[PDB]
Ligand binder design. Sequence first.
Ligand SMILES: CCCCCCCCCCCCOC[C@H]1O[C@H](O[C@H]2O[C@H](CO)[C@@H](O)[C@H](O)[C@H]2O)[C@H](O)[C@@H](O)[C@@H]1O
Length: 173
Amino acid sequence: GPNYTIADYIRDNHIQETPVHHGDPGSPTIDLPVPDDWRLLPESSRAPYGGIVYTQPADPNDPPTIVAILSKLTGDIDPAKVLQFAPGELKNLPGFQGSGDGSAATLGGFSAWQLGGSYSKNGKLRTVAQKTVVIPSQGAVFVLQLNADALDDETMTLMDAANVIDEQTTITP
Ligand SMILES: CCCCCCCCCCCCOC[C@H]1O[C@H](O[C@H]2O[C@H](CO)[C@@H](O)[C@H](O)[C@H]2O)[C@H](O)[C@@H](O)[C@@H]1O
């Protein structure tokens, strides 16, 4: 899309990006909570840093989910620019509609950005949101992204889980 993204920022600069997994030497420890009625997702192709899925979905083939990704950025990386370009990805979604570009936030004591809204996929309105947390540590900038997605009618399920995540997550570099 026409919006500059974090991926564009990485591509256009002398920045190395490497995926991070639980237990990797040199990486932060991120304790995400598992809200009630949600179940933990292990690390997989579809949940690179794990995630959570709602255990009482209206459509078991399309349940509300919050998936985590953790990346390690080294080189000519400015943590403030990661936050600056965080809204680009969602804003490029087909028919995305949200309240502006989102807002600043914090998670586990680190600076973050969150935006949410709706988009249309296969003729169905979906609620989507992304929280990006910048974690400068150990000669690198780690970037955590939490990607929430659900059918429009299950928007409140996502919002409830988000409050639990916002209040209980700890991040220790
Ligand atoms: C921690 C994991 C990630 C974070 C937790 C996940 C929480 C997700 C909650 C996200 C709910 C965000 O959606 C809120 C709403 O945004 C848009 O409306 C807003 O923007 C429109 C165009 O500017 C205005 O016309 C509307 O008045 C204004 O409400 C969509 O059109 C709505 O359909 C959607 O409901």
